[PDB]
Symmetry: none
Subunit: 205 residues, 2 copies
Amino acid sequence: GSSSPLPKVAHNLGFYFSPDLTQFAKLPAELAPHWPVVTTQNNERWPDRLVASLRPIHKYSRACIGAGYMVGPSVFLGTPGVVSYYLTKFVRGEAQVLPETVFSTGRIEVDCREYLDDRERVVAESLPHAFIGGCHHVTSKYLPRFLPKESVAVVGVAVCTLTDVYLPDLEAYLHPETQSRCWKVMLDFKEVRLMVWKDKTAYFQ
Amino acid sequence: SSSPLPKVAHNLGFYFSPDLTQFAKLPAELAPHWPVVTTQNNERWPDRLVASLRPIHKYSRACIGAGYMVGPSVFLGTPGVVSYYLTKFVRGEAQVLPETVFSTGRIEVDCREYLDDRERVVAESLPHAFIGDVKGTTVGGCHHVTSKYLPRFLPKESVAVVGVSSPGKAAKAVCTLTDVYLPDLEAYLHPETQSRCWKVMLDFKEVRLMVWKDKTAYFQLE
């Protein structure tokens, strides 16, 4: 069996249907040859496909490190430095190079408010204005336990914007050459904008 | 006063209660007309299920080792110790309740630990039923609340189904799990044939248990 992306990841690669994965909208097996589709079935029969796997499958399989993932009905947290799933994208039959990206951790989905590890605490401590009052990281001190889920906006997909990205993945951004930079960041294959003010604050827009 | 976990009463047909918070509020005026769970042996309610602390009948069943609640709070069963008594009245007259095993409350309270040393050894004895292991891309044998590869969220069900994971190594879409006191299953773990399917009553629900001696063992719904 294989793990598989959170919906937003496939969505951002342009995938919405799946015959086999229930986090996505259903499409019958029979129609997969004629529509792009996310799956864990590496089915040569379906030419436009995104396949999730736990072992690479072609040189172009991207190892999705540290991502939130799902297995059957369950959601799991990414483990930093550990590969969540591989993704291999086939357009009109042939495997395609994926852009490089960072990954959401799954802390949002599973409502977890903790640092994943000491290294991430150490990064938050190094710029303590970052990601609170606007835009909160999942671990922000000021975030109340009961959020009203309807009115929350997620970075990479309003009461607030919210991210669960693993801080070290981002930490070079927090330290630009210029006094401040509006970066161009790939998160879950979606281009967001991280705005850094060296040594004061940073946040997404 | 001690009460059954919601699933136990559901399995018996009972969803309304005037008194017990864990259930659906029903106003007293209607209690005469629905099956109800209650800590009140009330004659006015012909179809009722009473949770006692001591019996009131030939047919009053002891719920031994069962997880239970007092007000808003869940508590673990202790194995060997009855948690509460239950009596089924139908049209004013007590009924014989089937013989059953009991979920322990661990899933409700998120306590993923053995109840006692004794259970530790059973889990350890049949590790591909009760602990887990991987073969390349596949995990199996994590069918208990104590097992490896478990998600953070577990359905509050007698037999819960979850996806399961060895981060970076293996995954399973479907894995079937309970929090039963493992020794209550010993009777079933040692057959002669290559496989066997038991019928088992768990939390008063009829469930099927596959056993592959001495490889794995898992519950399933009908």
